[PDB]
């Protein structure tokens, strides 16, 4: 629980979602001042922000955005460390000169964060390029844990009972059975990779969610982005394995990405 007197907010909205807005601020730490990004709420939204805060409090990894704390003032606020370069999709739309090697570096970082989330038995449920935040052009972190869930000790998936879902990033078992696991987040990671190598283009352009479900059920998949290495398109296709049981987990994905990244680092030198 943070002290509102130690928080200074800038009026400009950096971005927004259903929850409310994201604003820049400054928080007075024990000695240094820390630049922060603050989610400010516009019943359900409050409980959802507190649950998001409860998830973030449990996470500690270099590739996951750190929560500083929460504050109840003019509205409920979730204060995070600031990722100065903002969302990855917007960044790549604006910086088309970012190299294939640099994209591999960033998505590999996302895979390391996801490997940690999987080991931690949390499901993200909103893994998309808009939710990867850049600290620098060479350092990505995962944010936006509003749909995330801590798996029960006796289950490897979360069963949704009820909603407004990011359907183009969801695996077939999410749509068909409402079952969310770390393997479902792997499918989303495949879509995130496609977005990254497409420089922030939207996936399944011009298609309704129902048309996407129909396409995937026919065994069809999005094509290879221009300039995307064959090895990376191969990995996207493996993430898009229909049967959740034969789809790789994040330890297998991160290892494949790590090895290819070292190969490219070797080709560069
Ligand atoms: N820690 C953070 O910086 C941070 N964390 N989460 C989120 N969530 C957003 C929700 C709304 C949609 C985008 C995101 N998914 N936005 C953060 N910053 C941020 C937003 C927007 C612009 C900029 C420029 C620098 N930073 C920006």
Break the chain into its structural domains and give their ranges: 1-82, 83-269
Q: How far away, in angstroms, is 261 Cα from ligand 1 center?
A: 27
Phi, psi of 156 (to 5 degrees): -105, 10
- Indicate if ligand 1 lies below 6 Å from the C-beta of 135: no
Residue 120 assigned ligand-binding role? no
Q: Which residues contact 37 (CB under 8 A, 6 or more apart)?
A: 14, 22, 23, 24, 25, 79, 80, 81, 82, 83
Is residue 126 among the annotated active site residues?
Answer: yes
Quickly count: other Cβ atoms within 10 Å of residue 1's Cβ: 6
Is 10's C-beta closer than 6 angstroms to any atom of ligand 1?
no
The listed CATH number (2.60.120.1600, 3.30.200.20, 3.90.550.10, 1.10.3720.10) that belongs to domain 1-82? 3.30.200.20
In short, whether 22's Cβ falls inside 6 Å of ligand 1 is yes
Q: What is the CATH number of domain 83-269?
A: 1.10.510.10
Q: Output the DSSP codes for 175-208.
A: HHH-EEEHHHHHHHHHHHHHHHHTTTPPSSTT--
Q: How far is the CA of 65 from the centre of ligand 1 (A)?
A: 10
Ligand 1 mean position, distance from CA 14 (Å): 7
State the first-to-last Cα distance of the chain, in angstroms, to the nearest integer.
48
């Amino acid at each position: 629980y943070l002290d509102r007197k130690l928080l200074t907010l800038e009026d400009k909205e950096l971005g927004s979602g259903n929850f409310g807005t994201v604003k820049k601020g400054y928080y007075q730490m024990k000695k240094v001042v820390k630049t922060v990004a603050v989610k400010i709420l516009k019943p359900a939204l409050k409980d959802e922000l507190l649950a998001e805060a409860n998830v973030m409090q449990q996470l500690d990894n270099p590739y996951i955005v750190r929560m500083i704390g929460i504050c109840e003032a003019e509205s409920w606020m979730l204060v995070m460390e600031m990722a100065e370069l903002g969302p990855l999709n917007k960044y790549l739309q604006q910086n088309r000169h970012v190299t294939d090697k640099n994209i591999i570096e960033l998505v590999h970082q996302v895979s390391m964060g996801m490997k940690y989330l999987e080991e931690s038995n949390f499901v993200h449920r909103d893994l998309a390029a808009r939710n990867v935040l850049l600290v620098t052009q060479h350092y990505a972190k995962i944010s936006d844990f509003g749909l995330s869930k801590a798996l029960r000790a006796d289950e490897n998936y979360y069963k949704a009972q009820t909603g407004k879902w990011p359907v183009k990033w969801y695996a077939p078992e999410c749509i068909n059975y409402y079952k969310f696991s770390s393997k479902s987040d792997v499918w989303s990671f495949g879509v995130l990779m496609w977005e990254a190598f497409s420089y922030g283009q939207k996936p399944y352009r011009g298609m309704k969610g129902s048309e996407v479900t129909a396409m995937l059920e026919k065994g069809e998949r999005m094509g290879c982005p221009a300039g995307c290495p064959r090895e990376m398109y191969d990995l996207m296709n493996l993430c898009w394995t229909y049967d959740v049981e034969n789809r790789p987990g994040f330890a297998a994905v991160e290892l494949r990405l790590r090895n290819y990244y070292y190969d490219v680092v070797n080709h560069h030198h």
